[PDB]
Amino acid sequence: SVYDAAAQLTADVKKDLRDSWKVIGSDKKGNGVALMTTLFADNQETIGYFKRLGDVSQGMANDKLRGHSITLMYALQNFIDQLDNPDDLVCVVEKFAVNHITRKISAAEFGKINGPIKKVLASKNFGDKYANAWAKLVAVVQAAL
Amino acid sequence: SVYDAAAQLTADVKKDLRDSWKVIGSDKKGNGVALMTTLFADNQETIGYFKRLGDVSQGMANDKLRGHSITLMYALQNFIDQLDNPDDLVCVVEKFAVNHITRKISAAEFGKINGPIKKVLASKNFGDKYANAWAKLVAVVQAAL
């Protein structure tokens, strides 16, 4: 279950998540747009899903993409803040899962975000250990998809 | 005009928003659910829109309502963090406006949240001064609906 995937996030994993988020989450606009542009660059097949955002190749200049990207970072802020209470983490994860289920995003497709996360983490010198930690948090969402 | 509405957030208004948010934003789960339960209690005609959440009279005990309420508080956190840059504030406000336009929520009905906000603020010893400041931020969203 989602609870099982969440309840498994250990003290060490939570530490790495919080330490990396302190840095990446400090610039939500910059890193949020970077995450999305990287997703579109490495997984061009996902571009069609974001038709509401217009021309995503516009990057930062695209107000709709910017608004979406900043908001996405607060979804992650939400997750990070709920780490010590699995019950709260689960209910917020399920809420966001619905937002993606309605768009027909499968657990496998959601996992495509791991590549971009790893790259942005590397841009701030956070290695594989950190990418693995984030993959575990992403896996909690996947349990709900 | 969302841009003219954003221009109404003067130095004094921004300060009041930040000062009150420091207190109420410190307990997103508690105050978020309080805001929702108050909305449903004083404006029963809006409950129909929240069909997905199930039995909202259960309050904190309802997992979907709790997840929704916590997330709503991060939408407000987002707005507060964008106060320095009107261009970014506008793009995130328009993003959330779409979430409500799709639910058939008009500017007039969105405005029904002002009552609950004033009541919750009052219970924390924040008077009309603060309620009016928040009404100005809510007005920015209304301009986009």
Ligand code: HEM
């Ligand atoms: C860290 C992972 C991710 C997070 C935290 C996240 C967060 C969000 C948020 C907060 C929204 C707005 C929901 C709404 O207002 O309805 C959104 C929308 C969306 N997401 Fe994600 N997302 C993630 C990964 C993905 C991935 C990998 C895909 C696709 C392969 C995806 C596809 C979508 C689509 C299509 C939308 C709708 C965009 C629109 O039309 O506004 N998401 N996401």
Ligand code: HEM
């Ligand atoms: C401070 C004011 C408000 C804020 C910041 C706010 C924020 C939000 C957020 C973040 C969501 C989730 C969006 C999504 O995932 O699609 C949401 C959903 C929703 N909001 Fe609001 N909202 C506010 C006031 C209102 C009011 C006054 C109404 C109705 C009179 C309203 C009706 C809805 C409805 C029907 C949903 C969909 C719930 C669901 O089915 O999951 N909102 N709101």
Ligand SMILES: ClCc1ccccc1
């Ligand atoms: Cl700190 C992990 C991360 C989150 C969002 C974007 C890029 C990296």
Ligand SMILES: ClCc1ccccc1
């Ligand atoms: Cl600080 C303005 C506020 C936000 C949420 C609930 C009550 C008041």
